[PDB]
């Protein structure tokens, strides 16, 4: 069975040492795993770019084209806005953006 | 006659800008642009806009 | 830390602290609370310790 490849745009001057380990395709590490103070912290991890990244703690996000609240990759691949809903093909990075 | 217009622009421009413009700071490297202290970071979303 | 000899112009110290705050994760809070401990602004979750 042929597996589809989804393409995410990002700047050319990208630190290549990110992709040499187990990385995140969104460009900013995120998720359910980091909590301990309140309930409205998942959105602050995933979208608030005032504070730095949780994993690589010297920057906000590797790409600013697929990481913000309403960026290109987030407007295209997030399941909430449902742009690719008429597509009958599975998107392999739906789970990383929703 | 393009003299009076340039003079009016130079007179108005001496106090039109009270701070540094955000589109002329293009000497930033990638590590400083990407850092969260950059106020221009939240306005860079699409690659064509 | 507080206690040393401050610089003569307050705007010089304000500009220096604002530039220093860029490029650093830990920073004092923006209002600079007088009669306080200057606690750094807490962040969200912790990844690797």
3-state per-residue secondary structure call for chain C: CCCCCCCCCHHHHHHHHHHHHCCCCCCECCCCCCCCCCCECCCCCCCCC
Nearest to A61 by CA among B43, B22, B36: B36
Contacts of residue C41 in chain B, CB cutoff 8 Å? none
Q: How far apart are CA A1 and CA C2, in angstroms?
A: 66
Q: Do B35 and A60 touch (CB under 8 A)?
A: yes
All chains having 3 or more CB pairs closer than 8 angstroms to chain A = B, C
Measured in whole angstroms, the distance separating CA C31 from the mean position of its chain's CA atoms is 9
Nearest to A47 by CA among A80, A20, A14: A80
Q: What angle do CA A45, C19, A63 make, to 5 degrees?
A: 35
CB within 8 A of C20, min separation 6: which ones? none
Instruction: Assess contact for A71 and B47: CB atoms under 8 A.
Output: no
Q: How far apart are CA A34 and CA B2, in angstroms?
A: 62
Contacts of residue A9 in chain B, CB cutoff 8 Å? 47
Q: Between the CA of residue A79 and those of A11, A40, B19, what are the distances in Å?
A: 24, 20, 41
Q: Which residues of C touch B (CB under 8 A)?
A: 21-23
The 10 Å CB-count burial string (b at 16+, else e) for A27-44 is bbbbeeebeeeeeebbee
Instruction: Assess contact for A27 and B1: CB atoms under 8 A.
Output: no
Q: How far apart are CA A75 and CA A60, in angstroms?
A: 19
For the record, the structure tokens of A29 come out as 């590490």
* CB nearest to B45's CB, from A11, A52, A71: A71
Question: Cβ of A56: how many Cβ atoms within 10 Å?
Answer: 17
| Chain A interface, best mutation among B40, B41, B43, B49, by max A CB count within 10 A | B41
Q: Do B41 and A64 touch (CB under 8 A)?
A: yes
Nearest to C25 by CA among C37, C48, C41: C41
Q: Do A59 and B46 touch (CB under 8 A)?
A: no
For the record, the structure tokens of B26 come out as 């293009």
Instruction: Assess contact for A22 and A92: CB atoms under 8 A.
Output: no
Is some CB atom of chain C closer than 8 A to the CB atom of A57?
A: yes
Instruction: Assess contact for B23 and B6: CB atoms under 8 A.
Output: no
Instruction: Assess contact for A90 and A19: CB atoms under 8 A.
Output: no
C28 phi/psi in degrees, rounded to 5: -70, 155
In which residue are the tokens 């990110």 written?
A: A18
For the record, the structure tokens of C15 come out as 């500009």
Q: Do C45 and A55 touch (CB under 8 A)?
A: no
Q: Smallest CA–CA separation between C7 and chain B, in Å?
A: 23
Technique behind the model: cryo-EM
């Amino acid at each position: 069975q042929a597996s589809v490849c989804e393409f995410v745009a990002m700047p050319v001057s990208t630190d290549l040492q990110y992709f040499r380990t187990a990385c995140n395709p969104r460009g900013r590490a995120s998720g359910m795993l980091y909590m301990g103070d309140r309930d409205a912290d998942i959105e602050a991890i995933m979208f608030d770019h005032t504070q730095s990244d949780v994993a690589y703690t010297d920057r906000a996000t590797l790409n600013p084209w697929a990481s913000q609240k309403h960026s290109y990759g987030d407007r295209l691949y997030n399941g909430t806005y449902n742009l690719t809903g008429a597509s009958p093909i599975y998107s392999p990075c739906f789970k990383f953006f929703t | 006659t393009l003299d009076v217009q340039m003079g009016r622009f130079m007179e108005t421009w001496a106090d039109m800008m009270p701070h540094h413009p955000h589109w002329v700071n293009e000497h930033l490297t990638i590590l400083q642009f990407i850092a969260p202290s950059n106020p221009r970071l939240r306005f860079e979303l699409n690659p064509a806009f | 830390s507080r206690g040393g000899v401050p610089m003569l112009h307050d705007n010089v110290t304000e500009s220096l602290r604002r530039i220093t705050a860029s490029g650093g994760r830990l920073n004092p809070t923006e209002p600079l609370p007088i009669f306080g401990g200057l606690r750094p602004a807490t962040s969200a979750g912790i990844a690797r310790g």
